[PDB]
Design an enzyme around this catalytic site. Structure first.
Site, PDB file in Angstrom:
ATOM      1  N   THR D  30       0.292  -1.508   0.059  1.00 40.08           N
ATOM      2  CA  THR D  30       0.269  -0.098   0.199  1.00 40.08           C
ATOM      3  C   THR D  30       0.737   1.358  -0.171  1.00 40.08           C
ATOM      4  OG1 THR D  30       0.031   0.060   2.140  1.00 40.08           O
ATOM      5  CG2 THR D  30      -1.986  -1.330   1.404  1.00 40.08           C
ATOM      6  N   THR D  31       0.423   2.166  -0.509  1.00 39.84           N
ATOM      7  CA  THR D  31       1.119   3.903  -0.204  1.00 39.84           C
ATOM      8  C   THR D  31       1.254   4.059   0.483  1.00 39.84           C
ATOM      9  OG1 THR D  31       0.004   3.866  -2.460  1.00 39.84           O
ATOM     10  CG2 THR D  31       1.520   6.074  -2.053  1.00 39.84           C
TER      11      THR D  31
END
Ligand SMILES: [Cl-]
Lengths: 250, 231, 235, 243, 241, 195, 240, 244
Positions: D30-31
């Site tokens: 995920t970012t």
């Protein structure tokens, strides 16, 4: 982490060959030529200072090394392997001899210790053999002057004269014709310079050649006076000027 | 393929196949369900037998008075991990006179599993765990994967056919979270949840295993005729 | 090659699955649990007639209240038996009591997955652990090299196991006597054995609360074999 | 070939393929981002809501080291936790011997040397995380980003994970439009926006925003989580910008 | 063909892992240069900050090992910092044990020995770096000593490292062929830095701004790195003649 | 476990050892045999601290028996005594030394000679025609110095030994409860059951 | 330390290293054990490919573990020395701690345990040796004969053979050895042991070794001439 | 991890052979031939140096014959460096025994010890075996004059006469033909040199290609003397026996 390579990396092949030792000898063959000649009153060892770059100061790279005051060494093959072997050889001369007997080891026994170290890198776990052949010249009271060759396997042989590395086959033939049991040290140096010229392509002078002798005691290199029995080292590295002087009488 | 020989090797796409194979062992395991309200937390487990002469393999293990889990996959690995939790719960009580927070227990399990995924010689754990507990911040439910990933949830399920129970809990979310001060109704919701994962077989008296922990309820396991009430 | 603790794509440990194949090649061992006691029986399977069969020891005492039968690579069982005997006696030392059968079995099974690169491989032998304690009465357990143990009312392991287990499926009920169990083990052993069953190539044993674990004499077993032959000829 | 089967093996290129494969695990994650502001740093992360059964605000991803350093990472979450545990041991031993809390550049190298050590042997696997971290010390604010190779640099803004390209572009605009600098409260707002904008690469599932910060004026140089009204304000600002 | 994976001999007597470590050395695409003055030793290295998000002050391949010794590295930054940390520890330990500052050539030999061990022991990989150590030694004067992944090391009058090392090397060779001395005959280090930058410009055929270069200077009893503004002053002087 | 005597005559070695064992103020036993057969033609008597004596003696016995089986050969008395001496010299610089003094009486079958070795707990070895440990020598050596010949028969050696014991029984304050006497010769080891 | 798992299971449930160790035993010279009513005889083959051998000093095939127990073997000669040494140490260790010599069964169980241990310990290979262990328990007149193999299993035998062509001599023993009436005397037991080896040996010269063990530590090795008299008498009865 | 590169030096083949031991024996078959012959009044050790040079210093050279103590010597066939490791260990064992028992170590006990060390490298440790075969010549007061051999497997045997190294099949046949039990040292000296002269791969057998040693009770009265022959002494015995 932990060294998990606890098994031998050198093993016998079906034909009985120890591959890694043979390949280490091949690396020695590619190395620059070095030689040794024994005279009645001394021993000479010599090699070419193959400078990797002209900007490099080749005086800072010592191919011929003092092991004890009366013992010197030269090599052919992998330079870094040689350097660490010289470190170990200097130390073992103290730990396994001088700290016990209060004197420096005889040539044959120091050679034996270096040989043992090289043998162990051929059997111990997770290591390759050393990629060098050594020529060790020395003097001691009871054995006189001697010259030894040590190979990657750990085998060592005493020589009257020999050569290792690039042009060893041609150089050994050249030495066979010139060597006799009546040579004086200056005659051996002359023959060493003649032999070494054949394997050198470019410049041939005191700055490109490295040469040392085991000969008479040098009280001028001892660094102190007052003890009669201490007369100085027999190992001496010839200067650039001293080599060039003998190249005019060549 | 060429990258699944050990846990110390990434694949070209950045996968860890030995960990994924360990995850597969959980999918082969028997279904177990976990769910909680604000006062209680419940574990429901479908036990599996070898044959008709054999006993049904136990699925739920008590870790402390206020904490315990259910397993799916390699049972001996659950015994190792639950033994570690028992020790950690116990270290907290003896040294700090403090009951071990469920969230901290999850962090400890994560780290223990992680070490087995990055080193040579070892293997990942081949079991999944559902940890329930009641601590100073109320009821809790955790899902443990042997990849190291630990997740806090309102409800979940792991094992074979666990997707059916998980969808049910996702629908019932708003209902079962509100079941406060009623242990029997919360268990009913869990028994109804695990029923969505059954095929051919049904819940019998030596098949079903239930555990509960809550506000004034120590972690207790129900087996045998003690679960006939819920069948 | 590949790790000893490697998982297959199906999520099974290769070495554990392979050790199970070695157990399938072992001689048959059968256990039947009743409310009067648990019976343990084995196929001796001597490789030659010159081999003195009474030296074949595939049924073993762990404690006075716990017995054990083995199938597979039987040499591997010796360290397991030694651990079991030590665990049983050590618990008596620490707690002045008999150890529970389940606890003993769990202690043996803790050794199972202690292999890697600890021992270099799993055990190649399965055990039938039979015993009695005050809390759970007469019990029979099947200890595997996976570390898993199931309790059984009746169980067969070894080469004739699936044929024997099907037979045990039909024959076992909760009201079996000790005598009925003895004849039942003999009957099923005789069915799956290659050679003809007698007192020299098959062995019986039992565990009761009163007398503890006992290995049966060849003379005692011979009578039970004769009793079996007559009752099968009776219909 | 076979050079990619074992860690610490140089390929004929001079590359360590096992480290490059670890980067793929990071790119799959995920970012997560980091923003350096006037007197501190802000950290933010995208948390994918896999299911409704996930308890909101409970599965906390950002981690504190000592009391002045924040750490966030993308990739294999357990690997990140292992690295933070080590970081905490490093920070404790530094403070034990030298009294003062570990400076951020000093802390950065401690993590760097440890991660680099896992590229030296075939008996260990490289870290499957890129870690963004930093805080305030005696010389001011510092933001760092550390890769699986052990490589790290100081940053004005940093981003990693699946939506890193989008995030980086947004960070580059802030650097250009604010040469004088960004305030801590502005950085929190901007961090929320960037995570929301970067969520387009993970648009299938909805997500939960998590933000933390260390600021000399706003948090007394201590790491704190952005909670309640300040978090909602940042969420509102972010939602307004995407529409 | 596992002789290519670990540091054992190939049939030709070669160590392929060492050779491949040399190739990793040029992965950064950075060139470095070192020269000696009368009283100083100067090292310059290209600085490339390709990302605008980077803090340019933290991007560096020059290290202050001790008070007297500086080190520039050619190779990836993780291995560079590994070597930097070890060299700092070795230099500090030396001073504690032997009561005087570790010489530049002695540190180079020590790091070269450590590198040799990685070429002989299988479990340890070579570091993919070339280390150029610089100082003004109290006995030997201005000093340049360079170490590589083979465990080789030697002293230098001047040296260059990187993808375009040959162009810089020949340029330096030609200058010293003219002057016929082993150093830059200049009093101030400022002018020695100007020489170093000028000859890198000539050899590479590229112009430099203040942010394109990185400079380290060794004088008696201290090694230091120049700031961007110090480098700018250097670039202005070069352009004005 | 205090008094042990030895005498080497023409064709045999005779060892005499007291029978008493004392715990506190009470004599527990008056028939204790303070000796171990190390090999068929080698006997060792011992005296020193309680426990250590038997433990050391049995440890030596086990080692010589191990050697005998491995090589199918009996070590010479000299070889056995050297082994024993080294073990005691080793032991004196240990954390807790073995406080044991020994006499080794053996018949060398190769040389056809009896041999008596005296070794104290420090590892002090001497070959003697007659020997003792502790204070035992203080009472007996003047008699042995006077009467001893190297050409004595076994019977004459026993008579001289009786005189030594009688002098001990007269001038020693401790009751050592008589002695067990054993003879070592070419035929092996035997006990004199009436003394 | 070197920890590599050399002995491991294969897909079909076999441990190949243990099975290949049995192949080393198959290559070894034949050894045979026969127990009479009041004795046990151990016979051993000596391959006559090696002459110019010094038989005084060459390691004999039968080894005393204690004064009352002997051990013979088939397989790797060097491997057998390690098992023999360990057995001899354990025998003395038992006498020292328990004050009785080992029983033959106990000694067998120990040697078999050492062999088993070397099949599931890391970094080691199995012993390429099978042993025949014979003797009499202290104060017992019942003969004892056991066999061990690389896997670590052991058992008692009325008569047994191991090594090369052991299949043939076992065939002979199975039809010639009667359990109801074992060789009543030393003569009959030795005769049957020599007969069994003559099925396989070649020349009955220096190729057959015989060691007789009787109760109460009475162990003797027969000489060439004594064995030669058995060889002579056997074939003269055969010419009929 | 590391497993990938492990050759596994201590495993059986499907036929029940030890790969590395067999390959080490193959190596030894190319080494210079060494011969030992036992007589009633002493033992002879004779060995061929491998293709030498004129510049080799022979009088200070030793590659074949080594002294273990005053009573025991060995002839080497194989890797000389490997042999020296074992030789030094054997020298220490002999002194350990002498210190412990105050008697010179019996020959077999020394031989068994070295052979056990070789055995260990074939069963555990994962290291390559020593590529060496020894001929042991020694004397003690139990068995008198003794000859033994050991090889990389750690197996050892006793001999009246024996060869190791190159052409052992041919050499052993020649020894088996001419050897007799009542033979004396001077006769054994001749047999050894004649056998080497016929089996050698060289064109002719000369003094510079040989190492020679005897163990004799030809020491003044009941004691034993070791004689490592000098180059000139090997040259003389070659003329005496009529080979040169
Ligand atoms: Cl060093």
């Amino acid at each position: 982490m932990t060294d998990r390579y606890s098994f031998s990396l050198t093993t016998f092949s079906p034909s009985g060959k120890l591959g890694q030792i043979d390949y280490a000898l091949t690396a020695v063959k590619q190395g620059v030529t070095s030689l040794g000649i024994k005279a009645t009153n001394g021993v000479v060892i010599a090699t070419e200072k193959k400078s990797s770059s002209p900007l490099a100061m080749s005086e800072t790279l010592s191919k011929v090394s003092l092991l004890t005051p009366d013992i010197g060494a030269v090599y052919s093959g992998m330079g870094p392997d040689y350097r660490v072997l010289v470190d170990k050889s200097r130390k073992v001369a103290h730990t396994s001899y001088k700290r016990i007997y209060g004197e420096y080891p005889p040539t044959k026994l120091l050679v034996s210790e270096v040989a043992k170290i090289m043998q162990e890198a051929t059997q111990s776990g997770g290591v390759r053999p050393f990629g060098v052949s050594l020529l060790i010249a020395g003097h001691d009271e009871f054995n006189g002057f001697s010259l030894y060759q040590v190979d990657p396997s750990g085998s060592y042989f005493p020589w009257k004269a020999t050569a290792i590395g690039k042009g060893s086959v041609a150089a050994k033939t050249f030495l066979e014709k010139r060597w006799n049991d009546e040579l004086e040290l200056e005659d051996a140096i002359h023959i060493a310079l003649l032999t070494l010229k054949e394997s050198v392509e470019g410049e041939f002078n005191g700055d490109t050649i490295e040469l040392a002798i085991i000969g008479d005691e040098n009280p001028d290199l001892l660094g102190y006076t007052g003890i009669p029995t201490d007369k100085g080292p027999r190992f001496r590295k010839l200067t650039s000027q001293e080599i060039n002087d003998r190249l005019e009488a060549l | 393929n060429n990258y699944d020989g050990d846990t110390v090797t990434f694949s070209p796409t950045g996968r860890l196949f030995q960990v994924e194979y360990a995850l597969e062992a959980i999918k082969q395991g028997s279904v177990t369900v976990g769910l909680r309200s604000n006062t209680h937390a419940v574990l429901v487990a479908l036990k599996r037998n070898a044959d008709e002469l054999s006993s049904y393999q136990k699925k739920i293990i008590k870790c402390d008075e206020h904490m315990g889990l259910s397993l799916a996959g390699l049972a001996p690995d659950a015994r190792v991990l639950s033994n570690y939790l028992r020790q950690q719960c116990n270290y907290s009580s003896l040294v700090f006179n403090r009951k071990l927070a469920v969230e901290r227990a999850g962090h400890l399990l994560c780290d223990k599993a992680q070490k087995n995924t990055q080193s040579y010689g070892g293997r990942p754990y081949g079991v999944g765990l559902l940890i329930i507990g009641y601590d100073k911040s109320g009821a809790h439910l955790l899902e443990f994967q042997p990849s190291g990933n630990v997740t806090e949830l309102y409800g979940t399920a792991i094992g074979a056919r666990s997707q059916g129970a998980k969808t049910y809990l996702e629908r019932t979310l708003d209902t079962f979270i509100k079941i406060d001060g009623n242990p029997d109704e919360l268990i009913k919701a869990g028994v109804e949840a695990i029923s969505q994962s059954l095929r051919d077989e049904s819940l019998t008296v030596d098949n079903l295993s239930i555990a509960i922990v809550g506000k004034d309820t120590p972690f207790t396991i129900y087996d045998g005729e003690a679960v006939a009430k819920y069948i | 090659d590949r790790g000893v603790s490697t998982f297959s794509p199906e999520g099974r440990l290769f070495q554990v699955e392979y050790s199970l194949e070695a157990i399938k090649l072992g001689s048959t061992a059968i256990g039947i649990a009743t409310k009067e006691g648990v019976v343990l029986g084995v196929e001796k399977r001597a490789t030659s007639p010159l081999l003195e069969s009474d030296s074949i020891e595939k049924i073993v005492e762990i404690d006075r209240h716990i017995g054990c039968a083995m199938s597979g690579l039987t040499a591997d069982a010796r360290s397991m038996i030694e651990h079991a005997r030590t665990a049983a006696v050590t618990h008596n030392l620490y707690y002045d009591e008999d150890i529970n059968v389940e606890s003993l079995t769990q202690s043996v099974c803790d050794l199972a997955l202690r292999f890697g690169e600890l021992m270099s491989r799993p055990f190649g032998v399965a055990l039938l652990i039979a015993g009695h304690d005050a809390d759970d009465g007469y019990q029979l357990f099947h200890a595997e090299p996976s570390g898993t143990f199931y309790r059984y009312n009746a169980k067969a392991i070894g080469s004739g196991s699936e044929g024997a287990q099907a037979e045990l499926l039909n024959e076992w009920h909760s009201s079996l006597t000790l005598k009925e169990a003895e004849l039942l083990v003999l009957k099923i052993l005789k069915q799956v054995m290659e050679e003809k069953l007698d007192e020299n190539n098959a062995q019986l044993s039992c565990i009761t609360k009163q007398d503890g674990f006992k290995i049966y004499d060849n003379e005692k077993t011979a009578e039970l074999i004769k009793e079996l032959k007559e009752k099968e000829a009776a219909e | 070939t076979g050079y990619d089967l074992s860690n610490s093996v140089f390929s004929p290129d001079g590359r360590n393929f096992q480290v490059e494969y670890a980067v793929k695990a990071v790119e799959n994650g995920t970012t997560s981002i980091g923003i350096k502001c006037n007197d501190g740093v802000v950290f933010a992360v995208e948390k994918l809501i896999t299911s409704k059964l996930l308890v909101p605000q409970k599965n906390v991803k950002i981690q504190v080291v000592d009391r002045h350093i924040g750490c966030v990472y993308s990739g294999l979450i357990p690997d990140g936790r292992h690295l933070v545990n080590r970081g905490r041991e490093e920070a404790a031993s530094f403070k034990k011997l030298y009294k003062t809390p570990i400076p951020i550049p000093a802390f950065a190298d401690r993590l760097g040397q440890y991660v680099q050590a896992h590229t030296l042997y075939n008996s260990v696997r490289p870290f499957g995380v890129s870690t963004i971290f930093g805080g305030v010390d005696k010389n001011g604010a510092h933001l760092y980003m550390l890769e699986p190779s052990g490589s790290y640099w100081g940053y004005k803004g940093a981003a990693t994970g699946k939506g890193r390209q989008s995030a980086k572009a947004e960070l580059e605009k802030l650097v250009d439009h604010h040469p004088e600098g960004l305030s801590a409260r502005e950085a929190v707002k901007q961090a929320a926006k960037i995570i929301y904008l970067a969520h387009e690469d993970n648009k299938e599932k909805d997500f939960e925003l998590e933000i933390s910060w260390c600021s000399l004026s706003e948090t007394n140089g201590l790491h704190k989580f952005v909670k309640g009204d300040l978090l909602q304000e940042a969420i509102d600002f972010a939602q307004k910008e995407i529409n | 063909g596992y002789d290519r994976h670990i540091t054992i001999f190939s049939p030709e007597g070669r160590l392929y892992q060492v050779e491949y470590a040399f190739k990793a050395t040029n992965q950064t695409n950075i060139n470095s240069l070192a020269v000696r003055g009368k009283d100083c030793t100067v090292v310059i290295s290209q600085k490339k900050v390709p990302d605008k998000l980077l803090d340019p002050t933290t991007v560096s391949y020059i290290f202050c090992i001790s008070r007297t010794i500086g080190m520039v590295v050619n190779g990836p930054i993780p291995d560079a910092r590994n070597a930097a940390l070890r060299a700092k520890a070795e230099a500090a330990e030396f001073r504690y044990k032997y009561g005087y500052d570790m010489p530049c050539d002695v540190l180079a030999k020590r790091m070269a020995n450590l590198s040799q061990i990685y070429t002989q022991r299988a479990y340890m990989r070579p570091l993919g770096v070339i280390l150029t150590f610089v100082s003004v030694d109290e006995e030997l004067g201005p000093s340049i000593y360079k170490t590589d992944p083979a465990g080789y090391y030697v002293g230098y009058k001047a040296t260059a490292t990187g993808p375009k090392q040959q162009e810089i090397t020949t340029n330096l060779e030609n200058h010293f062929k003219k002057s016929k001395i082993d150093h830059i005959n200049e009093e101030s280090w400022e002018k020695v830095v100007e020489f170093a930058i000028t000859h890198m410009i000539d050899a590479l055929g590229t112009e430099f701004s203040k942010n394109d270069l990185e400079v380290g200077v060794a004088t008696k009893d201290k090694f230091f790195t120049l700031s961007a503004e110090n480098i700018e002053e250097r670039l202005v002087a070069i352009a004005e003649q | 476990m205090d008094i042990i005597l030895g005498i080497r005559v023409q064709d045999s070695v005779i060892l005499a050892s007291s029978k008493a064992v004392t715990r506190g103020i009470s004599v527990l036993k008056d028939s204790d045999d303070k000796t171990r057969q190390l090999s068929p033609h080698t006997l060792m008597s011992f005296a020193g601290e309680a426990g250590d004596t038997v433990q050391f003696a049995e440890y030596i016995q086990a080692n010589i028996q191990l050697y005998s089986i491995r090589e199918d050969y009996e070590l010479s008395p000299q070889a056995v005594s050297s082994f024993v001496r080294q073990e005691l010299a080793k032991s004196i610089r240990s954390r807790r030394p073995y406080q044991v003094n020994v006499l080794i009486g053996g018949y060398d079958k190769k040389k056809n000679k009896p041999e008596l070795y005296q070794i104290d707990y420090l590892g002090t070895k001497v070959e003697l025609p007659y020997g003792a440990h502790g204070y035992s020598g203080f009472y007996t050596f003047s008699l042995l110095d006077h009467h001893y010949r190297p050409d004595m028969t076994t019977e004459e050696g026993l008579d001289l030994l009786k005189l030594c014991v009688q002098e001990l029984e007269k001038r020693m304050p401790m009751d050592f409860k008589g002695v067990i006497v054993k003879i070592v010769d070419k035929d092996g080891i035997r006990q004199v059951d009436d003394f | 330390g070197y920890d590599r798992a050399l002995s491991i299971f294969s897909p079909d449930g076999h441990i190949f290293q243990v099975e290949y160790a049995l192949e080393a035993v198959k290559r070894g010279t034949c050894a045979v054990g026969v127990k009479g009513k009041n004795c046990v005889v151990l016979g051993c083959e000596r391959r006559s490919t090696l002459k110019l051998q010094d038989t005084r000093i060459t390691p004999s095939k039968v080894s005393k573990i204690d004064s009352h127990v002997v051990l013979s073997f088939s397989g790797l000669n060097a491997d057998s020395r390690i098992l023999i040494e360990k057995a001899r140490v354990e025998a003395q260790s038992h006498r020292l701690t328990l004050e009785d010599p080992v029983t033959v069964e106990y000694l067998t169980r120990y040697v078999a345990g050492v062999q088993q241990r070397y099949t599931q310990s890391g970094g080691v290979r199995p012993f390429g040796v099978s042993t025949l262990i014979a003797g009499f328990d202290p104060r017992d007149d019942e003969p004892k004969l056991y066999q061990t193999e690389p896997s670590g299993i052991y058992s008692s035998w009325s008569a047994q053979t191991i090594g090369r062509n052991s299949k043939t001599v076992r065939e002979f023993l199975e039809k010639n050895y009667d359990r109801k009436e074992p060789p009543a005397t030393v003569e009959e037991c030795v005769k049957l042991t020599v007969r069994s080896l003559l099925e396989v040996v070649q020349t009955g010269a220096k190729n057959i070794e015989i060691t007789v063990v009787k109760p109460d530590s009475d162990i003797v090795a027969l000489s060439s001439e004594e064995i030669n008299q058995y060889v002579t008498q056997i074939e003269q009865e055969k010419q009929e | 991890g590391s497993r990938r590169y492990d050759s596994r030096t201590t495993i059986f083949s499907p036929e029940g052979r030890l790969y590395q031991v067999e390959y080490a024996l193959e190596s030894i078959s190319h080494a210079g031939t060494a011969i030992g012959i036992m007589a009633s009044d002493g033992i002879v050790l004779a060995a061929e140096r491998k293709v030498t040079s004129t510049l080799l210093e022979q009088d200070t050279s030793t590659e074949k014959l080594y002294k273990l103590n005053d009573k025991i010597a060995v002839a080497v066939a194989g890797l000389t460096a490997d042999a020296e490791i074992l030789i030094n260990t054997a020298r220490i064992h002999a002194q350990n025994y002498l210190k412990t028992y105050n008697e010179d170590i019996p020959v077999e006990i020394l031989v068994r010890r070295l052979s056990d060390i070789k055995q260990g490298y074939t069963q555990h440790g994962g290291l390559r075996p020593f590529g060496v075969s020894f001929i042991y010549a020694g004397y003690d007061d139990r068995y008198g004059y003794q000859l033994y051999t050991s090889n990389p497997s750690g197996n050892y045997t006793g001999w009246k006469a024996i060869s190791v190294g190159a052409n052992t099949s041919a050499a052993q046949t020649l020894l088996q033909m001419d050897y007799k039990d009542d033979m004396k040292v001077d006769d054994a000296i001749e047999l050894a040199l004649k056998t080497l002269s016929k089996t050698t791969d060289s064109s002719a057998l000369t003094y510079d290609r040989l190492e020679f040693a005897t163990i004799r009770k030809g020491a003044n009265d009941g004691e034993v003397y070791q004689k490592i022959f000098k180059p000139q002494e090997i040259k003389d015995i070659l003329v005496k026996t009529g080979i040169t």
